[PDB]
Design a protein around this ligand. Structure first.
Ligand code: HEM
Ligand code: HEM
Ligand SMILES: [Fe+2]
Ligand SMILES: [Fe+2]
Ligand SMILES: [Fe+2]
Ligand SMILES: [Fe+2]
Ligand SMILES: [Fe+2]
Ligand SMILES: [Fe+2]
Ligand SMILES: [Fe+2]
Ligand SMILES: [Fe+3]
Ligand SMILES: [Fe+3]
Ligand SMILES: [Fe+3]
Ligand SMILES: [Fe+3]
Ligand SMILES: [Fe+3]
Ligand SMILES: [Fe+3]
Lengths: 157, 158, 157, 157, 158, 158, 158
């Protein structure tokens, strides 16, 4: 079994995106932990682990088709200073991933490769869930304010 | 046994009110959950389940008297956007229900049907409890303010 | 993310159908229980609970796309006196739902919205299972007769 | 505390009715057991025990008001040969009891004695439940028939 | 919700009666304990706790109707030296309470307030039970006598 | 063993104060609960129970000296509307009790009655602890403010 | 509440004494442990912990009266080389503490402050117990001799 070059190109691009997201989320979680924001740090760490799992699944699929996974690329990593900036960077990453996923699913399903399409479908569902969470948090920050919002995620122990 | 038409009319009206309340409470709970207000959503969901139980009891009573329960009617459903509006809509629903319940209890007890009157009495007690809760929450929101009040019901986990 | 108005129209129509089915199934279960047919009533209750689960999933999907769920309109509720009539009404409801589901799945998948299509696919599978059950019960009633069939679902307790 | 003679008259009448019902139900249960109708007898015994409890409650209420309970008077006991006849006799007893209960509740509540009215209210609810069960069983027998209905309550043991 | 002033007046009067009964029963139980009549003292203490429960229910009902509970007014407390005198004082208190309860129930039920009527109904049942107990004990004392009756409620130690 | 009239007078005055404090604390706890302030209500209820225990101990001591406990008196009961007013009323009650306790301890210990002095000593220690708590809460309210302070004692239910 | 400056002066002096005793006892325990006398070291360490408990109680009492505890001042710490010298230093410390405690108790009880007097009473009882222990050990050393006495407190103990 040998997949089409275009399918492998799509999968490798998604893999590069996954690696970039992993790095960005881990760095954001560490930065949030250093400031005393504990629950945000826990949530961000869990998100980074989920991205790790996605990268593993993509690597397995690429290996099954007799391709060469790319572990050398990296997209630009965005780092914020306040909470709003971090949320906005995450939203940008998610939007890019969703657009790429939809286009790839269409192209893959047009050439009789169904398993890759299902993989992208699952990843797309997860990305939509995460983006919904991010938008909800941004709305909450907009309504309450920065200080009153941060007062709810600080713990002393 | 065949009940009077007026008793069955009262019971069917209360059933329609129960169904409307169930729908409104579930929609409000889902809307609150979508915004990140977790404990409010839990409380509203519990209230919706209680209304479901009330509807079931009313249906049983109507069936025992050899009547036809009405599952096709619906009153107007009110949807709010902020917390104050939701509380106000719930208060309106409760006030209407309480007035109807008192009138129905009087009429039923005037014609020698005691079990239906007892059913309405229990429902009336529950409605009064819920309306008291709603008024307390409105007072708390008035005293504190929307932002500080909402800061106490938000939690991000898993 | 804002979905197309046509997708939301399809989802809201399916939601209205779900609410109507919930009402009809619960009323039928109560009516069957009042007559002494306990085993039928248990199954009808289970079906009504499944219909609620479907309605909840649909509501969540509609909320995620920034739409307004419709909890105000209902279709026509069918009530039967015999058991054959109840089965026939349920069959009619199921056939309508299946037709709507297939058309909606095609339309949704034509516009690059995959998650909604998957939701409709799951609902369609469930509806097909239920319709198969209903047809089997109608065949059994036709073969045995109403009295001999009803003699098998009554208890004293 | 001494109650009005009319309240005590009502309570004693209701006690005589309870004793008659106890005797009739126990005799019917024994007769049904002799014929091999195993599942009906258990239900009939349970009904007889419930009547015993009702009689005890009435006796306690009468004693608290400084009255003399009547354990010497009985009404006419009806015995049936078929199952339809037994159900019909039970229905007659229940209808009489319900009428008496409603009239007594009205009279008692007109003279400021609330506890006796509540006692009759509870008894009335129980009587309504039992009469509903009896009517359902009569309908089932009418639909199925004597032999097919009786075939569902026999057991080898 | 705002109840009629007459209903609140009835409820406050019943509350005052409850507080008076609590005080009297506790004092009687302590006095009985000081003399060595342990088994009587246990029963009297339990009765005092029941009177507390009644008072709490009444206070909650009054608060739900947007009224002001009265915790400042008391009736006259009766204290006896013998056991017959204690039983007689308790009987007097119970008779007064029962009369008030019946009149209040009628008045409340005449104005479409059912929950308060149910509360008074429950309290009335409890009071009737207690008065029956008191009368039975008085009859036993009359039949046996003071010394032979008291010989059955004294215990050395534990 | 017959105590001096002055010692019994002191003990009866302290008993009257205890009964008044019990009533006031219970009413305040119920009022706080009706408004949605849960933890405050729990704390106030515990304080009322402690006052009940103090009253029981005083009654036992009075009975052991062959005296007549007074269960008919009552001092003026203070009721507030906001939290600050309730705390201030409690502070006033505590200050009065402490002054009376010190004077009584001196007088009792001057006449060779040591057990009563020890009883008052224990009660005095408890009163000082409670007054310290009240002053701390008043300082916290002064610093934070009423709304931000009340935002920390409100909960939903289940 | 604002205590008299003299009471606070007494309490602060006792606190300084407690801190000095804590330091001396811990140093003695460590020195004894370094030489191989394990059983003596355990007892001395326990005594140091008791001194901490006393210091904490004193600090809490001083804070309740709206005073400023003194954690900066120390007395002279005595260090011995042999065991007899350590026991003698401890005896000196205890005697000073007992004298101060008695005078302070009298002064405090003369001004109507009973809780502080009770605190000093408890501390005085503990000090008397410890001084009795020290004198018994000195007598044992005098009778047996240093070598035969030390032979009973050494363990190879891994
Ligand atoms: C999304 C909407 C709904 C949710 C989440 C929901 C949830 C539930 C659940 C979990 C139960 C108990 C499950 C069981 O024990 O089998 C229940 C029971 C019940 N529901 Fe619903 N349901 C919904 C819709 C409705 C509607 C629309 C009605 C009436 C129009 C209704 C009426 C009832 C009744 C009467 C019961 C009592 C069932 C019994 O006792 O047999 N429900 N509901
Ligand atoms: C002067 C009036 C009162 C006196 C002398 C009094 C006395 C007492 C005493 C000494 C106890 C002992 C409880 C124990 O040993 O744990 C007690 C129990 C109790 N009383 Fe009172 N009380 C009075 C008023 C009230 C009121 C007005 C209420 C309610 C609003 C009340 C509620 C209670 C409760 C709840 C308990 C038991 C607490 C528990 O079991 O958790 N009391 N009473
Ligand atoms: Fe991912
Ligand atoms: Fe309801
Ligand atoms: Fe469905
Ligand atoms: Fe009966
Ligand atoms: Fe009472
Ligand atoms: Fe006290
Ligand atoms: Fe010390
Ligand atoms: Fe993601
Ligand atoms: Fe309600
Ligand atoms: Fe279905
Ligand atoms: Fe019956
Ligand atoms: Fe009572
Ligand atoms: Fe106090």
């Amino acid at each position: 079994m040998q997949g089409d070059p275009e399918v492998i190109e799509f999968l490798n691009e998604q893999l590069t995106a996954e690696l970039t997201a992993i790095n960005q989320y881990f760095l954001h979680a560490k930065l949030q932990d250093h400031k005393g924001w504990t629950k945000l740090a826990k949530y961000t760490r869990a998100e980074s682990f989920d991205e790790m799992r996605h990268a593993e699944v993509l690597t397995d699929r690429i290996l099954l088709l007799d391709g060469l996974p790319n572990y050398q690329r990296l997209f630009h990593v965005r780092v914020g200073q306040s909470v709003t900036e971090m949320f906005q960077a995450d939203r940008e990453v998610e939007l890019e991933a969703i657009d790429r996923l939809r286009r790839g699913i269409e192209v893959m399903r047009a050439k009789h490769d169904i398993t890759s399409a299902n993989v992208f479908e699952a990843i797309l569902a997860d990305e939509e869930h995460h983006i919904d969470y991010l938008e909800t948090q941004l709305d909450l920050i907009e309504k309450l304010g920065e200080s009153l919002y941060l007062s709810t995620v600080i713990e002393q122990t």
